[PDB]
Ligand binder design. Sequence first.
Ligand SMILES: O=Nc1ccccc1
Length: 162
Amino acid sequence: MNIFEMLRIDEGLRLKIYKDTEGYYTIGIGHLLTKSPDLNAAKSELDKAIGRNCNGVITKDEAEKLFNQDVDAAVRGILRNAKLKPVYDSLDAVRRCAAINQVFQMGETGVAGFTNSLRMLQQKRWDEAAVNLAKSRWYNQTPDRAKRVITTFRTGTWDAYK
Ligand SMILES: O=Nc1ccccc1
């Protein structure tokens, strides 16, 4: 297991524009296109992201290219965030993957409401952090995924992903 395999399980792979769990147009491996309800706006974003007229459909290679960019950008964002960087750097490699996963799903903004969870993670109070992380809109809206990510933070193992 690694961050790509982990997010691939959590996000799936779809080659046509679909709506994510929040109703937002998305494609590939969880690549958010837009929060606009206008499908034409989503198609424009897609074409801009891929560099050709896609008419709402991409290839597996194209999906994987967006995914590589999106994972890179998520990690680099954490490093550029004054609240997230010290916590991230304090973690082991497996728990770092849980942090990347949460930022990929929620955006660095959301993760940076999580002040108390972040402090507990930096303190390596793993069971306490895990309890706090579940007291969230995140967990209530996507509980099966949140449970896997939380187990990863709690244990520093890949048990929730096999
Ligand atoms: O709350 N988990 C996180 C820790 C460090 C960076 C991003 C998220």
